[PDB]
Scaffold this active site. Sequence first.
Site, short mmCIF file in Angstrom:
data_model
loop_
_atom_site.label_atom_id
_atom_site.label_comp_id
_atom_site.label_asym_id
_atom_site.label_seq_id
_atom_site.Cartn_x
_atom_site.Cartn_y
_atom_site.Cartn_z
N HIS A 100 0.87 -1.19 0.00
CA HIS A 100 0.00 0.00 0.00
C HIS A 100 0.91 1.24 0.00
O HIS A 100 2.05 1.13 0.42
CB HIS A 100 -0.86 0.00 1.25
CG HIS A 100 -0.17 0.43 2.50
ND1 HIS A 100 0.04 1.75 2.82
CD2 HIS A 100 0.32 -0.27 3.55
CE1 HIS A 100 0.64 1.86 3.99
NE2 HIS A 100 0.82 0.63 4.46
N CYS A 101 0.36 2.35 -0.42
CA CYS A 101 0.98 3.66 -0.34
C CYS A 101 0.06 4.62 0.40
O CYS A 101 -0.66 4.22 1.34
CB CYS A 101 1.47 4.18 -1.66
SG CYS A 101 0.29 4.04 -3.02
N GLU A 102 0.02 5.88 0.01
CA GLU A 102 -0.88 6.81 0.71
C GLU A 102 -2.32 6.54 0.29
O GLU A 102 -3.22 6.52 1.12
CB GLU A 102 -0.47 8.25 0.44
CG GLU A 102 -1.26 9.32 1.13
CD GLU A 102 -0.71 10.72 0.96
OE1 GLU A 102 0.23 10.94 0.16
OE2 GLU A 102 -1.21 11.63 1.65
N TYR A 140 -2.94 4.09 3.32
CA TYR A 140 -2.94 4.51 4.73
C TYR A 140 -3.98 5.56 5.06
O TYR A 140 -4.58 5.55 6.16
CB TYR A 140 -1.53 4.96 5.10
CG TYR A 140 -1.34 5.26 6.58
CD1 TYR A 140 -1.07 4.24 7.47
CD2 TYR A 140 -1.41 6.57 7.05
CE1 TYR A 140 -0.89 4.49 8.81
CE2 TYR A 140 -1.23 6.84 8.41
CZ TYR A 140 -0.97 5.80 9.27
OH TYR A 140 -0.78 6.03 10.59
#
EC number: 3.1.3.48
Length: 178
Positions: A100-102, A140
């Site tokens: 995952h990233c932002e 996130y």
Amino acid sequence: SDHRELIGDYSKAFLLQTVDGKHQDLKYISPETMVALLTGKFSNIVDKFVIVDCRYPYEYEGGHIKTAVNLPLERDAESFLLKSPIAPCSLDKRVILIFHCEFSSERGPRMCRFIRERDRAVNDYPSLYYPEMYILKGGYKEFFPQHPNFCEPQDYRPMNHEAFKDELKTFRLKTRSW
Ligand SMILES: [Cl-]
């Protein structure tokens, strides 16, 4: 029985329930499923699960999911995951990766496709070290507001954070390509 295709080495079905996400061919899970893994709901079956946070170091440092590892550069990811593969303590059990990233819109998906490419390259088709990989839908940003107590520190630092413009710029100059 499962209504979907098999995992990457075609050995069995995907364990987790998936949701719709932008990349139609990738498998995405919701925050709730992330918490079921973290609270050990699949302990009988999942030996290990690695959460790969692909954001830049300052984002990760400002708040991440507990136990997640930060691997923002392809080079770091290949070394941590493919140099000495993380394997299950029991053949009965599974290893799963979550990226995952932002927002899990770009960074996350890309790193995910890159690891599968390398895993394919170094193995005899169709074996893989990580046949089952998911993307955390929403990244996130959607996770934090829902389960703040599963993150450390209990905060959120966006990539576009005004006080880290310099950090952003410095970090991009470290990537293999722009
Ligand atoms: Cl890179």
